[PDB]
Write a protein that binds this ligand. Sequence first.
Ligand SMILES: [K+]
Ligand SMILES: [Mg+2]
Ligand SMILES: [Mg+2]
Ligand SMILES: [Mg+2]
Ligand SMILES: [Mg+2]
Ligand SMILES: [Mg+2]
Length: 108
Amino acid sequence: MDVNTALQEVLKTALIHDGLARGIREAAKALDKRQAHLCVLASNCDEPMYVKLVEALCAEHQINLIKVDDNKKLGEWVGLCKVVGCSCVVVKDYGKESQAKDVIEEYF
RNA sequence: AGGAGUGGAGCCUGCGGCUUAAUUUGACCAACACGGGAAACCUCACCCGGCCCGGACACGGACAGGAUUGACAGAUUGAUA
Ligand SMILES: [K+]
Ligand SMILES: [Mg+2]
Ligand SMILES: [Mg+2]
Ligand SMILES: [Mg+2]
Ligand SMILES: [Mg+2]
Ligand SMILES: [Mg+2]
């Protein structure tokens, strides 16, 4: 039960329950709205202001953050599949509690 | 054999012609108050001008580092499209 597998399962559940906000604009709106318990970041993105703003907003809202490696893999996980490639995700809510969610909380 | 008429008058209404941006069009005993057709808009088919897609689905491309949607004001417009 690796943290990668836990993230994949929780993202799949959130998408199936429509609790996922993909993209930097949607993620920023969800974070500023005092919602969206968790956030996922991709280390592949080459834009420095991107990661700077993502981390600054996440820290200001005081919510968990995860830095995954590949933007394309993150997009394929969040369900943009040819994969567009998501470089920042937000979990507005989880559909149902699961062992993957528990593992993510423990990693937090 | 007759009665009431029509054809004459004014008007209503349909048809041709003429005119027009358009005067939408069908029909010439068995067409012409016929299309149940008494049209201000709609009807609308015609003319002038301006929005919209309400172009399914398939394939390909562009895309969450955003494909795309809508919009306040001021110009613009017949118009608060
Ligand atoms: K007469
Ligand atoms: Mg007469
Ligand atoms: Mg006969
Ligand atoms: Mg009338
Ligand atoms: Mg009319
Ligand atoms: Mg009209």
